[PDB]
Write an enzyme that holds these catalytic residues in place. Structure first.
Site, short mmCIF file in Angstrom:
data_model
loop_
_atom_site.label_atom_id
_atom_site.label_comp_id
_atom_site.label_asym_id
_atom_site.label_seq_id
_atom_site.Cartn_x
_atom_site.Cartn_y
_atom_site.Cartn_z
CG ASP A 290 -1.18 1.13 -6.42
OD1 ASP A 290 -1.71 1.16 -7.55
OD2 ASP A 290 -1.44 1.97 -5.54
N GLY A 292 0.39 -5.86 -6.42
CA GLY A 292 0.06 -7.13 -7.05
C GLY A 292 -0.38 -7.03 -8.50
CE1 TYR A 294 -2.51 -0.25 -13.13
CE2 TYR A 294 -3.37 -0.89 -10.99
CZ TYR A 294 -3.57 -0.38 -12.25
OH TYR A 294 -4.84 0.01 -12.64
CB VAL A 296 5.13 -0.50 -6.37
CG1 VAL A 296 3.68 -0.73 -6.00
CG2 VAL A 296 6.09 -1.25 -5.45
CD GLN A 298 6.05 -2.44 -14.75
OE1 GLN A 298 6.68 -2.83 -15.74
NE2 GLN A 298 4.83 -2.88 -14.47
CE1 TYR A 374 -4.72 8.24 -4.97
CE2 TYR A 374 -3.20 9.89 -3.99
CZ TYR A 374 -4.51 9.33 -4.13
OH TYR A 374 -5.59 9.85 -3.44
CG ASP A 375 3.54 10.80 -7.61
OD1 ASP A 375 2.39 11.23 -7.83
OD2 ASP A 375 4.45 10.84 -8.47
CG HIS A 423 -9.20 7.15 -1.72
ND1 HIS A 423 -9.62 8.46 -1.88
CD2 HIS A 423 -7.88 7.21 -1.43
CE1 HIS A 423 -8.58 9.27 -1.74
NE2 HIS A 423 -7.51 8.54 -1.48
CG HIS A 425 -3.99 5.52 -0.01
ND1 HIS A 425 -3.70 5.59 -1.36
CD2 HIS A 425 -4.63 6.67 0.30
CE1 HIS A 425 -4.19 6.72 -1.85
NE2 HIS A 425 -4.75 7.40 -0.86
CU LIG Z 1 -5.72 9.19 -0.98
#
Ligand SMILES: [Cu+2]
Ligand SMILES: [Cu+2]
Ligand code: NA
Ligand code: NA
Lengths: 620, 620
Positions: A290, A292, A294, A296, A298, A374-375, A423, A425
């Protein structure tokens, strides 16, 4: 006047003008990243030179460029062409997201796959996801996105409730062609909606919650000067914002009597990766970087008073560049406030008759970002007693799949026919340390058990040991919760009044690190996530644990490459990189919108002060 | 009417009258423990019969008694004479603590030791500490306390700053005899004061802290009925208080639609041990069982509004017995309030255009206790989303010693000549589970790493495994932070809408357990502290992990003896016992009064609900 002030709209406009006049910002050019450069190491740096680093994409297929510009002098400092097959692609552009769904909507293979499932193409949303590097040789040197489909029954419907499993497409977003459409078979599209605003799902709203009013009738205890310099309860720091990393803290220092004592030179979350553990070929490539890939910052939210941030809130509104070099303000993107934090210290003494209670407080600096489903909330806390803490809050909507008939070892069931793949995070905190100055070292501290015998006749003794990390090749460390392992950052040349080196202790949560097989693509590209702690010698260009260009880079960039230099870190200018993360086996309670879960780390003083630093807190 | 109501002053006076009438409470008797018994298993049962358990000490040396009384019927149910050399001594009486310093002040060996150090006996305070079980055969069957000395320079002085090392005395508090005085040599008494309210030490108090006002204009969201029954945001529970355990939570349940679903039948901290790791003979016997030996509820503080508990506070004032059977009120001993707890859930959806934010809150039930130099806060939290959490807060003044001139592997230096021995603070939570009823089981859940190969060609898959604990002999478990180990308590006969058993997941902090050699006295007496998790089959008399009579009791009682029964725990009425604690290597910042440090655990629903339980929270 401060070199660490936030970028202003005027600075970004000047950068745009400099680029345009230099011939570097024609109509086929897009800015993929723009950010201010920190001052280089120089305790006598007096002449202000505000410099910006820019990644420039070319939508016609020409090679991209990395450009450094001086806004103070109005000049281009350097411009280099990039060979992306070698050093990696540029971050994903917001405008490329739309391209994926539009291209697939006219591809005959995509349309036939949807027709077999009786899905109206106008209702099919496509999540545009980063590609990684796998077995497809035709992808080397090209900008690829991969797309997964979700059905939206009506414009306000939550499409995440309706994944279209068994189908994935790969797209070249520069040549605008669909390279592959893979259909592994028909799965029922889960039919229940997940609309957490629908009264039919929520039921009648509670009427039992009475208000909690948090006010500061004399205003807050901190001051903000120069736009982003904070002074609060002996703490001093500068709040930065970068479109890639988000909130960055600079020059964290503590006023001990009449000395301003440095603690951390720069603190940031320098990467965040979300690897998925479902071996289905539909998703086995899925790994978000997220930070590298996307960026984060912006996607930071505007935070609403009374909902997102409660209390007496001071906002910062950072400015970033859009893809054409125009300044964009993120209104109310950063919340700052102080919070009561319970009892600080308490003792009722029988012999002296003195009863003593003091309350604790923390300063909170936070922002929230949204990346697709996701937030994430990023929270930095400073406490009265010298503790520094980071906490990440994960919420939003889980990424979904079909739930296979007969079950799965790698997917949770959330609703009939609806699955959520396992998954993680995983975050990387980059802590450019400066404990009482730049001459620092790291020690690993383990508990030591002792055996009953001579000198320990009752078998009660226990102890600890500290091991200095002296070279980068020995500074890649793992957690050991069972032995109470922590790491101490100390200054061997600054002693407390007991003639011991001053230090700070890092307390990890000791959650699992990256679970993927060590030979996997994701383990090579996210090598930082395989170990809990790394220590490097500071260098100006070693900014991210995954390297500068993460998107579609084949692997090994960042920390493995830095560490290989095997530099001296024993009483030197060093950087601590701490990996920490959540391992998420989704539960039914995470659906249809997930309650917050948290992970973080903290640093506590360890003989930094000559006694408790909060003896001068008043009784209220 | 509720059988779980707090004991009343009238009930305690009535117990006194019943014991007096029965001939059990003459002038030589003392009440060492008095508490209400929980109802036996059986819905409704014998209408309602309030029973009390009493431990009765005899100051003339006669054998003590354990007595059960029915206050409803005015009868003694049972009375048994105790053989304390076999089954353990009664808890320490408050009046016995005062005896130690007075007896030593007239003993010529003690006076000679103080004269050798040029100390005035009138300024020497003696900390009276529990004795444990060691090599002294004359202590078997006697009530012994051990005393360590500290100098108080003036009446308001903190004596903890001035330990008198090299000296310890043992005292028989019934026969009023000093059994042994041990002097291993003169150490300098550290001279610096530790008076944290002396302006000479604090400096001028801060003027920078502005007020934080937390108010509830419409009052709190919870209701209190029947004295101690709470309803708050779908939670239902009864708040008990016991002089040994402190705050006890009963009948924790959650209102899910129309049905009240049980979760935990009884939650308490059933023991806490504080073992010291200094092998000096002056302190190598030092281990506090604060719950079992001292009774933490007896030393609960009165909590002051605005200082200890901030906000809209509802107090409970529990009643306990003094040593003669008179009721004593602990005014404002329990604080209850709700607190804002940040963001609960948040998502901004690009495709639907819906932005959604909700705030979290928690209900707090707390009390504080002071035992000598240490002060402990006990906090229970209930959250909107079904999470239950416990937090212990440790503060007060650290226990001190001399710091040896050549250094030490088992003691930290805090000030010139002043040491603080290493130690731990270890808690045992007893959770009488009732997940959707009493048919429960425990599964251990580990992350499972998978190797790259067939069916996992990209090496990204990971999974988990659950192992049912079926018998007590296999239900003694260790943490494993590296494999993400948690434990799930489920009900195999109650399924959610996905036909999965409902459950709750226990998340531990994975701190080190007891460090002492396994052959030591403390490892035998505190066997519970050597493992992270125990599961037993419920039994009325299996209340404490250390047994009923901990003081001066060898091993032989408690959890190791319970689990030997090897009872079926697979879908049965079970009790989870979780060990957790802090390992304290004192730092300079802990002196002269320690900032709070914390440890705890939490339980989160795991498919207990059919979806998120907080979809009906309003925006407000
Ligand atoms: Cu999760
Ligand atoms: Cu301690
Ligand atoms: Na540094
Ligand atoms: Na039970």
């Amino acid at each position: 006047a401060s070199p660490f002030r936030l970028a202003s709209a005027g600075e970004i406009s000047e950068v745009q003008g400099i680029l345009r006049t230099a011939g570097l910002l024609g109509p086929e050019k897009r800015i993929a990243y723009l950010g201010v450069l920190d001052p280089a190491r120089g305790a006598g740096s007096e002449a202000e030179d505000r410099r910006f680093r820019v990644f420039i994409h070319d939508v016609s297929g020409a090679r991209p460029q990395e450009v450094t510009v001086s806004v103070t002098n109005g000049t281009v400092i350097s411009a280099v062409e990039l060979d992306t097959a070698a050093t990696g692609e540029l971050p994903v552009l917001e405008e490329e997201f739309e391209v994926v769904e539009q291209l697939l909507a006219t591809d005959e293979r995509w349309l036939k796959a949807l027709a077999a499932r009786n899905l109206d193409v106008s209702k099919v949303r496509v999540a545009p996801l980063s590609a990684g590097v796998f077995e497809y040789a035709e992808e080397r040197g090209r900008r690829i996105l991969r797309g997964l489909a979700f059905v939206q029954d009506f414009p306000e419907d939550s499409a995440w409730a309706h994944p279209v499993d068994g189908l994935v497409a790969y797209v070249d977003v520069v040549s605008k062609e669909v390279t592959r459409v893979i259909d592994t078979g028909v799965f029922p599209v889960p039919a229940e909606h997940g609309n957490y605003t629908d009264p039919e799902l929520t039921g009648p709203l509670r009427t039992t919650q009475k208000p909690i009013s948090i006010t500061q009738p004399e205003g807050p205890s901190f001051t903000v000067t120069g736009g982003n310099h904070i002074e609060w309860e002996k703490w001093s720091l500068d709040v930065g914002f970068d479109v890639r990393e988000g909130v960055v803290l600079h020059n964290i220092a503590f006023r001990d009597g009449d000395r301003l004592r440095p603690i951390i030179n720069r603190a940031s979350i320098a990467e965040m990766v979300v690897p998925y553990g479902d071996p289905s070929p539909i998703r086995s490539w899925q790994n978000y970087f997220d930070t590298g890939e996307y960026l984060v910052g912006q996607y930071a939210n505007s935070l609403e008073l009374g909902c997102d941030c409660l209390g007496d809130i001071t906002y910062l509104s950072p400015v970033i560049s859009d893809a054409f070099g125009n300044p964009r303000e993120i209104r109310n993107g950063i919340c700052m406030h102080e919070e009561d934090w319970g009892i600080l210290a308490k003792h009722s003494d029988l012999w002296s008759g003195i009863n003593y209670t003091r309350r604790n407080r923390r300063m909170v600096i936070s922002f929230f970002t949204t990346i697709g489903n996701y937030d994430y909330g990023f929270y930095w806390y400073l406490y009265l007693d010298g503790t520094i803490e980071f906490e990440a809050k994960a919420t939003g909507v889980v990424f979904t799949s079909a739930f296979p008939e007969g079950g799965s070892d790698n997917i949770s069931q959330l609703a009939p026919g609806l699955g959520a793949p396992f998954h993680q995070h995983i975050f990387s905190a980059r802590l450019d340390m400066a404990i009482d100055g730049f001459t620092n070292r790291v020690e690993e501290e383990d508990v030591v058990r002792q055996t009953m015998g001579p000198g320990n006749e009752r078998g009660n003794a226990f102890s600890r040991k500290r091991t200095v990390l002296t070279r980068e090749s020995e500074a890649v460390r793992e957690a050991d919760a069972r032995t109470g392992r922590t790491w101490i950052i100390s200054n061997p040349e600054s002693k407390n009044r007991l003639n011991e080196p001053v230090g700070y202790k890092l307390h990890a949560h000791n959650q699992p690190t990256l679970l993927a097989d060590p030979g996997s693509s994701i383990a090579r590209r996210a090598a930082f996530a395989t170990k809990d702690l790394w220590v490097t010698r500071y260098a100006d260009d070693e900014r991210y644990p995954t390297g500068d260009f993460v998107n579609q880079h084949s692997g090994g960039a960042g920390l493995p490459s830095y560490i290989a230099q095997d530099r001296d870190i024993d009483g030197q200018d060093i950087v601590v990189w701490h990996t920490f993360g959540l391992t998420h086996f989704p539960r039914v309670e995470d659906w249809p919108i997930m309650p917050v879960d948290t992970v973080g780390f903290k640093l506590r003083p360890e003989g930094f002060f000559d006694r408790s630093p909060v003896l001068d807190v008043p009784a209220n």
